[PDB]
């Protein structure tokens, strides 16, 4: 019969996306911030979220914040090369000392713009998973996930110390301005199990909530 085709396609045209495992990898790709210009980003893929494998956690060279990014889907992302990357292990100087910062409150020194001494209380959550001489750390009055070489910090005296599940679950946040923002819980902290990571659809930050 001689009709107009309508949702025409073909099964051949239909390749998988996110085939190759890029965990551990070093990546460059482009970034089109709105109508803005196409800058290049380089970084290191730390994890791939088990309960949403569209989602990668990237550490970008010289951004302190960990980024959750849906690397294949996201259309601000272009030209995604996986660099080959080295036979440089970087092992850890003192792992008795590193293994007793997991879990601890800490006080972390930051310069202000004038070069004056600011200290921010945080918590150290875990050692980062690919670059395992960095730590996941979150802060009390910035509760998103950050990454630093907290030994280097301790070493130069810039850091001090003192004494089932719902992973998968979609969640929304109740703004006092009426709207909602939908995300999902993506990780549970092995050290402080009352602590989880949320990732909201409209933002690349991983947020750390204590949910008990």
């Amino acid at each position: 019969h001689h009709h107009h085709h309508h949702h025409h396609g073909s099964s051949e045209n239909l390749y998988f996306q996110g085939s190759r495992n890029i965990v551990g990898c070093r990546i460059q790709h482009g970034w089109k911030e709105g109508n803005g210009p196409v800058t290049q980003w380089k970084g290191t893929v730390l994890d791939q979220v088990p309960v949403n494998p569209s989602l990668y956690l990237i550490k970008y060279d010289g951004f302190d914040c960990v980024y959750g990014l849906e690397l294949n889907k996201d259309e601000r992302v272009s030209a995604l090369e996986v660099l080959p990357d080295r036979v440089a292990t970087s092992r850890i100087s003192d792992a008795h000392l590193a293994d007793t910062m997991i879990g601890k409150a800490v006080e972390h020194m930051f310069e202000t713009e004038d070069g004056s001494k600011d200290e921010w209380r945080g918590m150290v959550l875990a050692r980062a998973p690919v670059m395992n001489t960095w730590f996941y750390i979150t802060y009390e009055k910035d509760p998103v996930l950050y990454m630093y070489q907290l030994l280097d910090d301790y070493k130069e005296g810039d850091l001090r110390i003192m004494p089932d599940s719902l992973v998968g679950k979609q969640v929304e946040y109740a703004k006092e301005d009426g709207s909602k923002r939908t995300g999902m819980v993506i990780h549970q902290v092995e050290a402080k199990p009352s602590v989880y990571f949320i990732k909201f659809d409209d933002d690349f930050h991983i947020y750390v909530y204590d949910l008990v």
């Binding site: 302190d64 930051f110 310069e111 202000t112 713009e113 600011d118 130069e156 810039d158």
Partner: peptide, 5 residues
């Protein structure tokens, strides 16, 4: 010696 953004 860390700058806040």
């Amino acid at each position: 010696r860390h700058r806040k953004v």
